[PDB]
């Protein structure tokens, strides 16, 4: 819709983001502590997605999302590897239908990204 578009335009985000950058270069803005809590937590999800680089073909968003969902379950204070393999086998099935990929080559990419053994995902695949 245009009416939801216009109300953000009249708030003037282009000029305000320019002054926020100039204030940073004149050292009047320091790093917020929300960002220090963000980059400390997110950084394990950033390099795990880059480890799926050798998957070729289709929209690979389902392989990326189900790997990010499976990694997040292992990062709880009480980790649940049962529900983590539930999201992992959805990534293996979504990967193997792409042109060029095998079942084991998608078992290579998923278990290498999550950093677990290949046999844990093969047991739940059936």
């Amino acid at each position: 819709s245009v009416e939801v578009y216009r109300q953000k335009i009249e708030k003037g985000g282009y000029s305000a983001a320019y002054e926020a950058t100039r204030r940073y270069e004149r050292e009047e803005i320091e790093v917020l502590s929300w960002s220090s809590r963000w980059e400390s937590a997110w950084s394990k999800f950033g390099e795990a997605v880059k480890a799926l680089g050798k998957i070729e073909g289709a929209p690979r968003a389902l392989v990326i999302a189900k790997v990010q969902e499976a990694l997040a379950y292992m990062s709880k204070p009480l980790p649940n590897m049962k529900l983590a393999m539930a999201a992992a086998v959805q990534a293996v099935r979504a990967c193997e239908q792409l042109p060029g990929m095998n079942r084991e080559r998608c078992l290579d990419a998923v278990a290498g990204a999550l950093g677990v053994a290949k046999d844990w995902i093969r047991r739940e695949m059936t």
């Binding site: 109300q7 953000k8 926020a20 803005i29 790093v31 917020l32």
Partner: protein, 119 residues
């Protein structure tokens, strides 16, 4: 001076509190906000069937079975069926019939509400 991803997150927040884009981001929509109404209804509907299930079979009420049954309702809509099959092995035995009661046996009322919410 610098442009890394820690400080890109900060300078985005700084422009938000400057131009007040959070509260005008919500109040200018006013159409998607009724999805909170429909989500509040399905959460009440799933939870009431979870308690009545616990009294007809004499099992104690297992908390967090509302959220498990609500995830499986949403994945059934998308089509992630091997996602469903592993979670059905994970829940205990007496509650597997409740989870398929939400998906299949309450496909009339509950699945139509998710069909109305994402629309």
């Amino acid at each position: 001076i610098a442009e890394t991803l820690t400080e890109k997150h900060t300078l985005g927040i700084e422009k938000v509190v400057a131009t007040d884009s959070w509260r005008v981001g919500i109040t200018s929509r006013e159409k998607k906000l009724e999805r909170i109404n429909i989500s509040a209804e399905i959460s009440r509907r799933i939870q009431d069937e979870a308690i009545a299930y616990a009294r007809n079979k004499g099992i104690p009420y297992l908390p967090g079975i509302n959220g498990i049954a609500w995830k499986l309702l949403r994945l059934k809509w998308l089509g992630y069926t091997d996602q469903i099959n592993v979670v059905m092995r994970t829940v205990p035995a007496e509650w597997r019939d409740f989870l398929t009661q939400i998906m299949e046996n309450t496909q009339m009322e509950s699945m139509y509400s998710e069909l109305r919410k994402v629309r």
